[model samples]
Target: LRDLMDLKSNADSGDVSAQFELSRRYLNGDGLEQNDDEAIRWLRMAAEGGLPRAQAGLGWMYAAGRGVNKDETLSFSWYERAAVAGFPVAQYMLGRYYEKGIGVAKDRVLAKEWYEKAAAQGNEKAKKRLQDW
Candidate 1:
């Protein structure tokens, strides 16, 4: 009930954080039915409003093609945005892209940079990747 109230209040007030939270709950079906399409709609709104986590989540969805068409290029672009914003997960994935040349060039240095950045934020995967690198 509170989630619904929060969603309604946030939606009515144009609150991006509330929008992201509501979208996340919608995606997970907490207090609501799982609706990827609806999740994407709200997530997009948050991302466009410049929410970093939403940008990273959107990037992840695009990369996985969750509730959206498969588009690696768009995924990479969103990841770049989120990565630069200091999202550890996005940094790691963007680093993976750089290392593997997935929708981007293979650049070990760039990958290392991203890994270091995420690791500094206490990202376990990023720390381990830095060790492996």
Candidate 2:
């Protein structure tokens, strides 16, 4: 009850972290049944509120179609948003998207630049990608 009231109320009031937390609970079925639709709903709210982690989570949801359409372009858009906000994981994901042209145009230079950004933040995946390049 406390979890529901507290998180939901905060989420309703535009608390981005609360929205993100609510999304996680809904997605993982912490208190309620695992509901991807509700999870994605809250996640999108947090993403719109400029939460980088939420943005990355939204990107993953778009890519995997957990509760939304599996749209690579949408996924790329979210990842780019979070990456530009200094999210390390998103930076790495953006690099992969740029390198492989998953949803955006293929640009090795852009990929390299993104990889460097993540690597600077000590992202292992980015370091490995850069090493391979």
Candidate 3:
């Protein structure tokens, strides 16, 4: 209870970690109402504050048109940012984007490179992708 209170306070204070946690809770309907709009609001804040997870979350939202418009390019951009920060999930997503040419030029080599990065981090999907490729 105290930690959640502290998290709420920190989130209100615009702490990136708190914002990210709050967004995650909202996104997952954990201890809070499931509200895509609320999650997007907080995620945008945390992502702008340079939280890699938030950035990836935002990317997924954009990609899925959950709370925002479906914009593959926007998704790609956010994924790129998080991937560059060495987030394995984002790296895997970037690889998918590259492989499918969703928002950028389709380049199998680039996709493999991103997949390799994610696989090195023990991302199962990435490893499977490499094996399947």
Candidate 4:
């Protein structure tokens, strides 16, 4: 509890890294109570503060609807944001979404571009998907 208070203090001080840490603690029950709302709160803060990992993690949460409502549209929006910010997993997912037209438009060229970006980051799945596509 004291540790969380310290983390929260740092978080309120506009420390994005601390915000992400607190978010992780809440999300994964690491040294704290599992609280999705709290996790989302801190994750959103970090993401808004330009933390790429937090953007990607929030994108996953939105994608999986782990703590929030399941909305593919929202998921796609977050994925797009993180992808544009150079998060590899988000890039791969954006590519996959484009390839499958899951929740976005079908554009093979764009998909290929995103896949290539992810492949450059050593994303094996992206490489395989590009081959299969």
Off by over 4 Å in 2: 1-3
Candidate 2 local lDDT, residue 40: 80
Candidate 3 regions exceeding 4 Å error are 27-29, 32-36
By lDDT: ranked, best first: 2, 3, 1, 4
> Residue 26, candidate 3: how far off, in angstroms?
3.6
User: Model 1: per-residue lDDT, tens digit, 1-133?
Assistant: 6868867697658888888988988889988899888888889988888888999888887788877887888898999998998888888889999989887889988989999999999898888868766
Model 1 residue 50 CA deviation (Å) reads 1.3
What is the TM-score of each predicted model, taking all chains together? 0.88, 0.92, 0.87, 0.86
Evaluated at residue 110, the lDDT of candidate 1 is: 90
Residue ranges of candidate 1 with Cα displaced over 4 Å: 1-3
> Can you write out model 3's per-residue Cα lDDT over 1-133, one digit (the tens) per residue?
7877898899988799999999889889998889878888888999999999889988998899987789999999999999999999999999999989998999998999999999999998899879988
- Candidate lDDT (C-alpha), each: 0.86, 0.93, 0.92, 0.86
The most accurate candidate by lDDT is 2
Residue pairs whose backbone atoms clash in candidate 1: none
